[PDB]
């Protein structure tokens, strides 16, 4: 027994949910029906151009989106909600930060909207206390 | 008394308490940094470039999460009066060293549980200076790289070369052979293997293990440190490379010895502990020796092998002592430490007694180890073939009446002057009561033995007489030896650099002294802080990772500089800074250190976290956080913000938090530590109560009617002892992971602080808190037992047996289980629940 | 709404609550009686003595503690209108039937856990009529005695003779051979042995258990009922003697068959659960079949042997079916029951498939079993030797859409009249929805089989067509089959006596009907009570142990009497009384039965304990006690004081106690029981909630704001489902022993009320409460989890995984462990702690 | 899961527990000193005559033996206090009422006081709650 202390919570996990906010909301518009992807994967910045040019090569178009107010963590699970979630088709409503390599492909969340109208409000809360961590809505004036 | 003059803590909702813990966590992501460690200085050997050295170390840069191998470039000159902050250059090119969600092997998780190393990535690495080899264990398999040996110093990060294997399972404990850097060694499946990095050639050397069944049926291991050694004697390896190479002289073959530990864990009791996979609902067997039960039957053995010029394992050979180890060395229960002399001549080993009162250092020359075969005629043959002169030399023999703390400091010298009479340095606490370095010269006079017949050695049969024992330090302070501290012996200038508590027990300072003459002890660190230091191998500059109770930890690089004619007065001048002190929280108050005297006029130190927004006059509820047990000092002049942030959270809610270093704690010498000899529990809680009385008198906000005593591991054990023997003072008692029955605990700790069950009977029943359960309170909501279910150290049985005896005595409790956490709460979710449960329990029932 | 109209429970101290439980204990001891059971009528056949019969039974006199074999003397003539209370004479002379302080073997304590035998002493005995042999197990050693066969009766008690053995270990499950009472048989080390009382000669018959190592390495047992069979199909023996003696005729020898179940449990998952000896910290392995995992590989086998007039087992012989069992009988997962036809012609067995919607009774004639030897030419040889005509007859095949409840009623008549075409009785719930008796005549039409070649059976392969299936009972009620009820078939008068719920669902009455025509169903018991009955084998007189919701249990002895030409209308006249009705304690108020209708307009019954010293106007805190699961009916007109005194203690503190049997609870037919099919856990809580709102409307003292839901096995699972899916009505939830993850529970239960996880993923995710932990309350002290640590039925893992998911979701709880108790809190001290914890939790937080 | 009702609480306390105090109080006037044997054995009626005959042919005396009013619950040990324990010798204190067959000598408490004088007090109580199970003072009037 040499001091089996609790050691608090290191939570060595910050400043990366901003740079995985920018990969969120991948939209594909060949007809006016639009489909969407979401990605949340930590610990590096060389993942960003690989996944960005990946969805560029696989025909998903960019938009700048709000970073989280406080960055999230890995080893833990988060929920995806909002006006477009539930009403329009979100099959992975559960997301989770877990590290995968810069080169390799990722878990997504497929989200169809169809004729989106003028806006789709979306949310990523945490599954711990459902604090409103992340906020957005997409704009057809920024669609391709 | 005055219920309008006592502080009532604002009762928050459960979600409120989570909001508070999360707001604490919003900057604990800042305050934890995992400051760099395991430094290796290498010179640039340029004399025309810009950088004088390259410092290699482990670190998490907070551009990434897991810690990684890094380096800094220490320049030849610095623009003075303007401080240089060293960049954290990444040595490797941003790969990850943990699998997804932290999944490890069970042996890796057990070893990390042993060292309590909570951070992820490359845990620790091994380095060889000449080749510039970095052999480390990262992710799935061993890796290596090099930087500036016969090759050069890179500027970009490189790729880590993987070590391929045909073997299954993890490859634990890897080490480079110093005599030949191409060769290395590791433990796999509890047997010693050796490989070669460039050709990929592997070789098993020991066959004490077979992998036939579970560990209940495959009991012999080799080269691995057992449980009690890992968790009480802080030795994590059981094999030591020979640092020099001998030549067998057949044609050109270079022999390479390895000292290893054979372990026969057949008779040691087996306990089942739940696996981390709760779904599988199976256990793991653990060879866990209780007090009085048989410890593993140990022995030392030489594993040699011979290689060609091209680096292929030509021959191999297990070797064993000419007589059995148990017979040549009676009363030897534990091999605390071992290694080799620097010239390679003798292999030393520190033995230790069953009662831990008879430590003795011994040298075992490699010719004492014959080859090991079942053929008793080859065995007799080489018993005649062993020369008469070669002999184990019991060089040093520490004997005490209290207990021997294992001090790993032992620096034997080259003995090129007058080639007998080994001269060494040795930390000796039992002599003066305090750990002080000595230079000891023992004369190695061999008497000549017939190793053919088997005989029983006497009491001090191999004991060499001492030529001289100059004491290099003396006083009422001690030299740090345990907890991975070390000495650094510059033999060129004849100085020895050590760490110590010469100013005060609350700080660790780097001191230097000459071993030629016990002269003047030069402090190198600034006072008013506490320092963890690490020297260069060239003894020209060191690092100090230091902190104070007020300032967070910083990591500064100092440079010994001055006239070379008097190297003892070389002035350490601040050269560059590596890590600066981080931003303290907006709602952090530094705690106040105090001291006081007992009725016996023994000086105890203590901490206090004052209540935030204190209004004078009001009495606040007080959480006596406690550990109290040996080998741990809670109070020292170091930063308490990273490990004891919950204590600040308590203060921020309005609880006075008191911390007292009761008698029996470390850093303060053997006579201080030894007041708990055979009376664990019977003196510490009295000192804690005394501290509370003192802090109550000094500061005016300690409500004696509202006292909580919270503790963990050994500390919880005291919280339960507090609620039993001092029930009127402690309102509640949050006992986390308590040791409730001493008779169930392991040998290494208990057989030392107390004795064998037949010897100290009243000490076991008085100290086993679960057998005094009738004296626990009749009132409810006064006792909260916390326990990690998968515990390997303080097993769940202890809480289970406590709850059993509470049931039988009809006493209430509360209980919280952490089904995934082993001994330290490691998962952040479980730690957040633990703290909100602690705040809620105090809020409602204190 | 009104704090002047909301009843406040008096906050007692913890010692106060103990004082209340002890005052319950003193009265409680008198209330509990351990009523006489296992009755055995024997005639006296004297016509000049005083006593007509001798009734033998188990009981505790109360002079002593352990229950023992006793007898009463039933006279030829009672003095009318003056009740005869029987003397309880002892067979044995006050010896210890169990060892000191209740120590058993681990398999004995496990068997008493499966049978739920809380009482100590001679728990079960075996009897042979003609020899008058009483073979029983006392203090882990077989004993025997004899009373009135070829010998005479007694008036003094005798010494019970011990049976000497060379076998090391316990001798479990003894049975007298009915064909030869000098021979008996038992299980030792999970292998079938056979012995002879007077000569002492023992003899092993099976060799499936090598005894070499742990049960992970020695997986074959024989004559042993496995876990899932013991705990879900209520079968505890796995071997059945042949009741007749056949003569193969070498020269004079006599065969004696035994049908047994060989079980090869190698491929079934092993789980470790902590042993009772906590100091050792070792576990026990248990071959526990998890849901979805594969069941043990079962098979039926004949262990025969041949003996002589001198009384020695001369020959022996294992036999096995001509094809392997799994191939000759596909879709056969469990052997529910087995035995023999009374003439000895066929060995019957009830098979049952893995969906548990397909049960079929089969007759296996002994010639179908060839000898067993590893020589495949001897095997083919006797495959040629078995006749072409002989055949297993699948006589009966129940198929359902809900699930098959195992009905152990099966009375094969002698078929020597009309020498083919077996006529039997059989309980059938799947046909009409309710368990009703039928007389079924099938036709054994053998087509001729070549047993040497292996064939694949078809879907209706051995299925004999039915000649006729006359229905002897019909209605909205059921014939009691399970839980050790039985029928009694007088073949001389041609009547079948059964138990049923025909008068009302709340009462078990003894009925009789003729199996020639369903003329009328004559009740033989007084209404307003519920009866557990037991007939003489001469069918002239019975015992009934009966009770009501108000009156304690009495045990009256009735005598069937009337003109013999009309046996169906024989009037049961009360002859004598055995154990008259005990004293209800003065604080005990018998509870009120009610009924109500749901929104589906189905009638649910319920109980209520009114608050003692009820004040009109005042609203009271309500404890919804709940089980709500299948095979258990809480609400019935029967004494709720010996088993539900805690509910009265709650009432005596002022809590309204409500008990509801929603849909799923048995004795109300299959369609009622089947409302939980594949949504178990989901519909019960709506029935419980509706029961609260009805009782709230009916009686005016139900406070909806303060509702507690307490449960122990499935009840604890429902209490947690209540707190999840109905949070606004249920204030707190004391969940004991809860089933938190269905995927972890065993096959027999779960695979029947839901099914395999591949089939019902939505039902498992919506029913496993531990996967729905996010919907538990954020408020603290609303959830108390109780669990016995050494549990083998609802393993500790369930509570552990719940606490795990609570930790991960950040939700508070409270928890109490009972470290030494398996599934029921057995020890009275631990039970007292459980009750004071329940009272305290309600007192403080409800 | 067949409903362990779990009412339990089966102490099954015997009315023999008053006359287990009668076995209590054996003293012997062989030397100048006087000493006592204490027995508490339920669950057999024959233990009375058995330990009676055994300890009068072992030369001991029977005293008054006041009976406990409560038939004591089985499974719990009962402690011994008083003015006797702590001044004059009592070798074991606590008594567990466990069964043995009447042919065996049981566990007994041995109590040496030397000279008797005005008497000295012995008490038997429970450790579970500390309520009075038994209480008396010895006689100088029921001796030879």
Swiss-Prot record, chains A, D:
<protein>
    <recommendedName>
        <fullName>NACHT, LRR and PYD domains-containing protein 1, C-terminus</fullName>
    </recommendedName>
</protein>
<comment type="function">
    <text>Constitutes the active part of the NLRP1 inflammasome. In absence of pathogens and other damage-associated signals, interacts with the N-terminal part of NLRP1 (NACHT, LRR and PYD domains-containing protein 1, N-terminus), preventing activation of the NLRP1 inflammasome.</text>
</comment>
<comment type="subunit">
    <text>Interacts with the N-terminal part of NLRP1 (NACHT, LRR and PYD domains-containing protein 1, N-terminus) in absence of pathogens and other damage-associated signals. Homomultimer; forms the NLRP1 inflammasome polymeric complex, a filament composed of homopolymers of this form in response to pathogens and other damage-associated signals. The NLRP1 inflammasome polymeric complex associates with PYCARD/ASC. Interacts (via CARD domain) with PYCARD/ASC (via CARD domain); leading to pro-caspase-1 (proCASP1) recruitment.</text>
</comment>
<feature type="region of interest" description="UPA">
    <location>
        <begin position="1"/>
        <end position="144"/>
    </location>
</feature>
Curated annotation (Swiss-Prot), chains B, C:
<dbReference type="GO" id="GO:0004177">
    <property type="term" value="F:aminopeptidase activity"/>
</dbReference>
<dbReference type="GO" id="GO:0005634">
    <property type="term" value="C:nucleus"/>
</dbReference>
<dbReference type="Pfam" id="PF00326">
    <property type="entry name" value="Peptidase_S9"/>
</dbReference>
<comment type="similarity">
    <text>Belongs to the peptidase S9B family. DPPIV subfamily.</text>
</comment>
<comment type="subunit">
    <text>Homodimer. Forms a ternary complex with NLRP1, composed of a DPP9 homodimer, one full-length NLRP1 protein, and one cleaved C-terminus of NLRP1 (NACHT, LRR and PYD domains-containing protein 1, C-terminus). Forms a ternary complex with CARD8, composed of a DPP9 homodimer, one full-length NLRP1 protein, and one cleaved C-terminus of CARD8 (Caspase recruitment domain-containing protein 8, C-terminus). In the ternary complex, only one subunit of the DPP9 homodimer is bound to NLRP1 or CARD8.</text>
</comment>
<dbReference type="GO" id="GO:0005874">
    <property type="term" value="C:microtubule"/>
</dbReference>
<dbReference type="GO" id="GO:0008236">
    <property type="term" value="F:serine-type peptidase activity"/>
</dbReference>
<dbReference type="GO" id="GO:0008239">
    <property type="term" value="F:dipeptidyl-peptidase activity"/>
</dbReference>
<keyword id="KW-0031">Aminopeptidase</keyword>
<dbReference type="Pfam" id="PF19520">
    <property type="entry name" value="Dpp_8_9_N"/>
</dbReference>
<dbReference type="InterPro" id="IPR050278">
    <property type="entry name" value="Serine_Prot_S9B/DPPIV"/>
</dbReference>
<comment type="function">
    <text>Dipeptidyl peptidase that cleaves off N-terminal dipeptides from proteins having a Pro or Ala residue at position 2. Acts as a key inhibitor of caspase-1-dependent monocyte and macrophage pyroptosis in resting cells by preventing activation of NLRP1 and CARD8. Sequesters the cleaved C-terminal part of NLRP1 and CARD8, which respectively constitute the active part of the NLRP1 and CARD8 inflammasomes, in a ternary complex, thereby preventing their oligomerization and activation.</text>
</comment>
<dbReference type="GO" id="GO:0070269">
    <property type="term" value="P:pyroptotic inflammatory response"/>
</dbReference>
<dbReference type="GO" id="GO:0006508">
    <property type="term" value="P:proteolysis"/>
</dbReference>
<dbReference type="GO" id="GO:0042802">
    <property type="term" value="F:identical protein binding"/>
</dbReference>
<keyword id="KW-0225">Disease variant</keyword>
<dbReference type="Pfam" id="PF00930">
    <property type="entry name" value="DPPIV_N"/>
</dbReference>
<feature type="active site" description="Charge relay system">
    <location>
        <position position="713"/>
    </location>
</feature>
<feature type="binding site" description="covalent">
    <location>
        <position position="713"/>
    </location>
    <ligand>
        <name>Val-boroPro</name>
    </ligand>
</feature>
<dbReference type="GO" id="GO:0005829">
    <property type="term" value="C:cytosol"/>
</dbReference>
<dbReference type="InterPro" id="IPR002469">
    <property type="entry name" value="Peptidase_S9B_N"/>
</dbReference>
<keyword id="KW-0720">Serine protease</keyword>
